[PDB]
Short mmCIF file of C-alpha atoms and ligand atoms in Angstrom, two decimals:
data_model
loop_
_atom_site.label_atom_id
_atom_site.label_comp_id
_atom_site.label_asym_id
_atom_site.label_seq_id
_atom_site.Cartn_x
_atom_site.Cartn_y
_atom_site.Cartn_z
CA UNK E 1 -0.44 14.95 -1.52
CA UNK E 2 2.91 16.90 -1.21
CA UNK E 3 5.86 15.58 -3.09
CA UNK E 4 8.27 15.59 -0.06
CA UNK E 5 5.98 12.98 1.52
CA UNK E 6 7.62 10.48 -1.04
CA UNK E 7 10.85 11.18 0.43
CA UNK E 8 9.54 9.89 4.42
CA UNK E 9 11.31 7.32 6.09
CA UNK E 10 9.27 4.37 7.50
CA UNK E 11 10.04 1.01 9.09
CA UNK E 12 7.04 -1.58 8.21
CA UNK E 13 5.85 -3.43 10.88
CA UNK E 14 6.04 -7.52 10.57
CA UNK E 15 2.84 -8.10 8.44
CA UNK E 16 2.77 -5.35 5.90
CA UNK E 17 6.41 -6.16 5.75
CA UNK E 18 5.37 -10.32 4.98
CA UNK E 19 3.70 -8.10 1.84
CA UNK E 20 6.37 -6.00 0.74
CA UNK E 21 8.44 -9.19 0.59
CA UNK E 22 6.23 -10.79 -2.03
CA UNK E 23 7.45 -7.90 -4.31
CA UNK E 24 10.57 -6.38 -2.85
CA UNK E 25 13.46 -6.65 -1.26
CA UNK E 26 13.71 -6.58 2.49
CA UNK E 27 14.80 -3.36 4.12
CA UNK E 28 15.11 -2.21 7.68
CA UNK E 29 13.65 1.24 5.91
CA UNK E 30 11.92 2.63 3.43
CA UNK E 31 10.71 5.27 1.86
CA UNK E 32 7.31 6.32 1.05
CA UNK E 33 7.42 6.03 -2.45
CA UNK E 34 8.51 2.59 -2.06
CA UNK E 35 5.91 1.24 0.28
CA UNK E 36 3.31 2.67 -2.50
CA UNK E 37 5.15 1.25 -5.47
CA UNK E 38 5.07 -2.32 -4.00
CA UNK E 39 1.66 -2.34 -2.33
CA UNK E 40 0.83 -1.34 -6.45
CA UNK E 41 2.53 -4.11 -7.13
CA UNK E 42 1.53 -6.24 -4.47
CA UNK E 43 -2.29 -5.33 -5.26
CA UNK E 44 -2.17 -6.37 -9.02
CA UNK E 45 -0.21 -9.89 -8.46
CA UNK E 46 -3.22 -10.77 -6.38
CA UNK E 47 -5.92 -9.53 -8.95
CA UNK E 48 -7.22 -7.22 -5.77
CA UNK E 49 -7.72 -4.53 -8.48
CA UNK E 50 -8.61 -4.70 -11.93
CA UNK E 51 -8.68 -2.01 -14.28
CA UNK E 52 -12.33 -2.76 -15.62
CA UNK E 53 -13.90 -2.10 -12.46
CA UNK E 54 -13.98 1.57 -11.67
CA UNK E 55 -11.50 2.55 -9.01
CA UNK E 56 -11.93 -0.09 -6.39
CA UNK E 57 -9.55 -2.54 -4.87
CA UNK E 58 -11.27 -5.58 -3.35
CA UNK E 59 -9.14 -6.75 -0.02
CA UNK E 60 -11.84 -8.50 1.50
CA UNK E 61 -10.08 -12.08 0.51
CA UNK E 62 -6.16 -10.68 1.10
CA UNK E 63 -3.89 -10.25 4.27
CA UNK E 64 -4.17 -6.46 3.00
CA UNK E 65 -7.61 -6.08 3.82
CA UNK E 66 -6.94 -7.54 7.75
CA UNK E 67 -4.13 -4.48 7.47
CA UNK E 68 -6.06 -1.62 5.85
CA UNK E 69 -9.38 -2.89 8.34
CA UNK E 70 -11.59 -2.47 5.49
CA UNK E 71 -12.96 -4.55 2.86
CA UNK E 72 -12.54 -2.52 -0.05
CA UNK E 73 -11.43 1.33 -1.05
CA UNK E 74 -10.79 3.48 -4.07
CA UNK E 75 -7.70 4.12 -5.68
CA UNK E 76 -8.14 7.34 -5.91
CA UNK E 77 -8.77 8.54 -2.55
CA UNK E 78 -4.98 9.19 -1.49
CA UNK E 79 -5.06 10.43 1.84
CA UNK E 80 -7.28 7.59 2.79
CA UNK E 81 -4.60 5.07 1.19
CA UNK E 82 -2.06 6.55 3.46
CA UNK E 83 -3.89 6.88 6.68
CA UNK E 84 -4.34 3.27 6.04
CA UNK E 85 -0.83 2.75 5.53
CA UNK E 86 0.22 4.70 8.46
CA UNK E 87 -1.45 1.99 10.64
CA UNK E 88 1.10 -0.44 9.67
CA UNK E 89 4.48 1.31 9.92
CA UNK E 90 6.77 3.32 12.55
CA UNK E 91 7.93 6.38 10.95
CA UNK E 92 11.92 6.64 11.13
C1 LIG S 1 -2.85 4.87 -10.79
C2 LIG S 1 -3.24 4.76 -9.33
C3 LIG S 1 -4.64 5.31 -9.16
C4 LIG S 1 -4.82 6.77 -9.60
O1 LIG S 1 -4.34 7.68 -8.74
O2 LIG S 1 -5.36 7.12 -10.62
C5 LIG S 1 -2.16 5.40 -8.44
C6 LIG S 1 -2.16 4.83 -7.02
C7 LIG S 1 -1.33 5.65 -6.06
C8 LIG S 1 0.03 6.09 -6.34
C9 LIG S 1 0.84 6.84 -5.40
C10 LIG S 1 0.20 7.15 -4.14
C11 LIG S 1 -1.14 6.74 -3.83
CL1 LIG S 1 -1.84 7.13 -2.32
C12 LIG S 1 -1.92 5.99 -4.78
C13 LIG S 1 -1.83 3.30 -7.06
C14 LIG S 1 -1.94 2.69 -5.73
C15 LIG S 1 -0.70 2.27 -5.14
C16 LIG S 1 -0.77 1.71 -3.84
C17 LIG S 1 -2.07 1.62 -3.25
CL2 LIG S 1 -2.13 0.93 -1.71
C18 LIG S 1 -3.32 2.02 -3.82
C19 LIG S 1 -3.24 2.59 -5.12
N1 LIG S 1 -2.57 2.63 -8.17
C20 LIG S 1 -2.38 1.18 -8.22
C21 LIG S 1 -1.86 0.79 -9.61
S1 LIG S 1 -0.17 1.23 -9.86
O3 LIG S 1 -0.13 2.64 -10.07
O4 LIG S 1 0.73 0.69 -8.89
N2 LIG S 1 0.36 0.55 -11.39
C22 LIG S 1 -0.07 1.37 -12.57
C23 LIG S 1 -0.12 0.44 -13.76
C24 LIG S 1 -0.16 -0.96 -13.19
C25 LIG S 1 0.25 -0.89 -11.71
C26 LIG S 1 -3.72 0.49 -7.97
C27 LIG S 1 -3.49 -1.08 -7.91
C28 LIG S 1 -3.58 -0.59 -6.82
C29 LIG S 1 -3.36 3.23 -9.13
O5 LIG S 1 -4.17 2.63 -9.85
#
């Protein structure tokens, strides 16, 4: 992923914003790197990942899961993350 798409603007829509919330302040914008920080965030307050299990975050049972529209994905596929993402914002 390029470093400049850190720096992209992005207005979450109402329930990924509900999420952000639980970890963050509220904002009419943010930035990339923020929206990843706190879904990190979010994702470990609600034990959807744990470190023992090999790369995948379990959603299934979260309001994150209903936003991503899947039940489960790896960490470390990034472009997938932010594709999934993308479905809940309006880019500034
Ligand atoms: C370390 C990482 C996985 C890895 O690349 O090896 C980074 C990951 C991340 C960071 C920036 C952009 C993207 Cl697309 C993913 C990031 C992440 C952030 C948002 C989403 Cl939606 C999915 C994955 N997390 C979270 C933990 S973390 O980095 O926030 N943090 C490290 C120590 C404890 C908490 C995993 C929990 C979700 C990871 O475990």
């Amino acid at each position: 992923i390029p470093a400049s798409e850190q720096e992209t603007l992005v207005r979450p829509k109402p329930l990924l914003l509900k999420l952000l919330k639980s970890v963050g302040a509220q904002k009419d914008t943010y930035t990339m790197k923020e929206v990843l920080f706190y879904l990190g965030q979010y994702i470990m307050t609600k034990r959807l990942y744990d470190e023992k299990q090999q790369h995948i975050v379990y959603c299934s049972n979260d309001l994150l899961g209903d936003l991503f529209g899947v039940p489960s994905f790896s960490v470390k596929e990034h472009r997938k993350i932010y594709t999934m993402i993308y479905r809940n914002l309006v880019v500034v």
